[PDB]
Enzyme design. Structure first.
Site, PDB file in Angstrom:
ATOM      1  N   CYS A 180     -45.673  12.556 -14.985  1.00  0.00           N
ATOM      2  CA  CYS A 180     -46.511  13.753 -15.155  1.00  0.00           C
ATOM      3  C   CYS A 180     -47.822  13.412 -15.845  1.00  0.00           C
ATOM      4  CB  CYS A 180     -45.770  14.818 -15.962  1.00  0.00           C
ATOM      5  SG  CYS A 180     -46.848  16.209 -16.451  1.00  0.00           S
TER       6      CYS A 180
ATOM      7  N   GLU B  20     -49.526  10.184  -9.331  1.00  0.00           N
ATOM      8  CA  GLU B  20     -50.298  10.856 -10.370  1.00  0.00           C
ATOM      9  C   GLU B  20     -50.808   9.813 -11.349  1.00  0.00           C
ATOM     10  OE1 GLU B  20     -48.410  14.264 -12.156  1.00  0.00           O
ATOM     11  OE2 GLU B  20     -48.237  15.301 -10.216  1.00  0.00           O
TER      12      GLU B  20
ATOM     13  N   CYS C 225     -39.768  29.678 -28.903  1.00  0.00           N
ATOM     14  CA  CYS C 225     -40.054  30.348 -27.643  1.00  0.00           C
ATOM     15  C   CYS C 225     -39.910  29.397 -26.470  1.00  0.00           C
ATOM     16  CB  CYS C 225     -41.455  30.989 -27.663  1.00  0.00           C
ATOM     17  SG  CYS C 225     -41.526  32.583 -28.583  1.00  0.00           S
TER      18      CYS C 225
ATOM     19  N   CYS D 163     -45.446  19.639 -19.897  1.00  0.00           N
ATOM     20  CA  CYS D 163     -44.933  18.979 -18.707  1.00  0.00           C
ATOM     21  C   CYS D 163     -43.582  19.589 -18.337  1.00  0.00           C
ATOM     22  CB  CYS D 163     -44.803  17.473 -18.951  1.00  0.00           C
ATOM     23  SG  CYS D 163     -46.238  16.736 -19.801  1.00  0.00           S
TER      24      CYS D 163
ATOM     25  N   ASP E  11     -38.615  14.500 -13.043  1.00  0.00           N
ATOM     26  CA  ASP E  11     -39.641  14.649 -11.997  1.00  0.00           C
ATOM     27  C   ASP E  11     -39.358  13.727 -10.807  1.00  0.00           C
ATOM     28  OD1 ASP E  11     -41.377  16.611 -13.258  1.00  0.00           O
ATOM     29  OD2 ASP E  11     -42.081  15.014 -14.571  1.00  0.00           O
TER      30      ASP E  11
ATOM     31  N   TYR F  98     -44.628  10.515  -8.638  1.00  0.00           N
ATOM     32  CA  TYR F  98     -44.328  10.249 -10.047  1.00  0.00           C
ATOM     33  C   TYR F  98     -44.002   8.779 -10.301  1.00  0.00           C
ATOM     34  CZ  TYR F  98     -44.269  15.259 -10.223  1.00  0.00           C
ATOM     35  OH  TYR F  98     -44.649  16.577 -10.124  1.00  0.00           O
TER      36      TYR F  98
ATOM     37  N   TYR G 231     -54.382  19.084  -5.434  1.00  0.00           N
ATOM     38  CA  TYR G 231     -53.124  18.945  -6.139  1.00  0.00           C
ATOM     39  C   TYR G 231     -51.966  19.458  -5.284  1.00  0.00           C
ATOM     40  CZ  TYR G 231     -49.574  19.631  -9.791  1.00  0.00           C
ATOM     41  OH  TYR G 231     -48.422  19.610 -10.546  1.00  0.00           O
TER      42      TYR G 231
HETATM   43  C1  LIG Z   1     -48.894  17.338 -13.699  1.00  0.00           C
HETATM   44 AS1  LIG Z   1     -47.153  17.796 -12.918  1.00  0.00          AS
HETATM   45  C2  LIG Z   1     -46.805  19.710 -13.171  1.00  0.00           C
HETATM   46  O1  LIG Z   1     -47.165  17.428 -11.216  1.00  0.00           O
HETATM   47  O2  LIG Z   1     -45.904  16.871 -13.701  1.00  0.00           O
END
Ligand SMILES: C[As](C)(=O)[O-]
Length: 213
Positions: A46, A89, A209, A200, A124, A129, A77
């Site tokens: 991320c 990324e 919260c 993230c 992710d 990633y 994106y």
């Molecule tokens: C920057 As992202 C929401 O693709 O981990």
């Protein structure tokens, strides 16, 4: 289980930059291109969290987030999140080599993620990633070789941890299929600074919260 697409099947993208006129860094106040600096491109998952890690590093003078390592030119994106661009990324890290070295930044990246997970980082999942180091400048291939040596020095340690092989992709940026880095939309640049309520994904908590500190 994720897979790269064939380049013939990849999204076509577009000819013009998605962010043609980036604003000065929200924390550092800079833009790229300061004389005397070097650039390294880092993929450790991320990019919001990754960008913050690097702009807070002494000697780093500019950062941005975006996409490299794939084929689609100037992806949005949303396009990259489909997996059909093959990009990962990336944090563009511009640094003062008299204050922090190439070697130190590679080590910092290695120690900040699990470089053995392939097309995934933590929760992710996706080729966007994956772990990567893309190099730049007149010594880009020598720097790539240098990153490989550093990265290979971690291999026995990771093997001993039961993690198998390092999956980090290392090569000059110019040698990736698109051969370029593409900045993400303005909203992504220093996202975590601009939106302190943001975090993230997959890092919510069970207290307060639910927003991590
Ligand atoms: C920057 As992202 C929401 O693709 O981990």
């Amino acid at each position: 289980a994720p897979r790269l697409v064939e380049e013939k099947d990849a999204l076509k993208g577009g000819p013009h930059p998605v962010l043609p006129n980036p604003q000065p860094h929200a924390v550092l106040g800079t833009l790229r291109g300061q004389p005397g600096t070097e650039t390294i491109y880092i993929g450790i998952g991320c990019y919001w969290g990754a960008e913050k890690l690097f702009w807070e590093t002494p000697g780093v003078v500019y950062t941005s987030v975006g996409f490299a390592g794939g084929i689609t030119p100037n992806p949005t994106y949303r396009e990259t999140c489909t997996g059909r661009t093959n990009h990962t990324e990336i944090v563009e890290v511009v640094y003062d080599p008299t204050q922090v070295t190439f070697d130190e930044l590679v080590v910092k990246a290695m120690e900040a993620h699990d470089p053995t997970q392939g097309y995934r980082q933590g929760n992710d999942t996706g080729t966007q990633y994956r772990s990567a180091i893309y190099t730049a400048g007149p010594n880009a291939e020598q720097q790539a070789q240098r990153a490989r040596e550093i990265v290979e020095h971690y291999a026995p340690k990771l093997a001993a941890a039961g993690l198998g092989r390092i999956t980090t992709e290392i090569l000059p940026l110019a040698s990736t299929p698109a051969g370029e880095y593409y900045m993400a939309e303005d909203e992504h640049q220093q996202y975590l600074h601009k939106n302190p309520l943001g975090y993230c994904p997959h890092h919510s908590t069970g207290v307060a919260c639910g927003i991590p500190e």
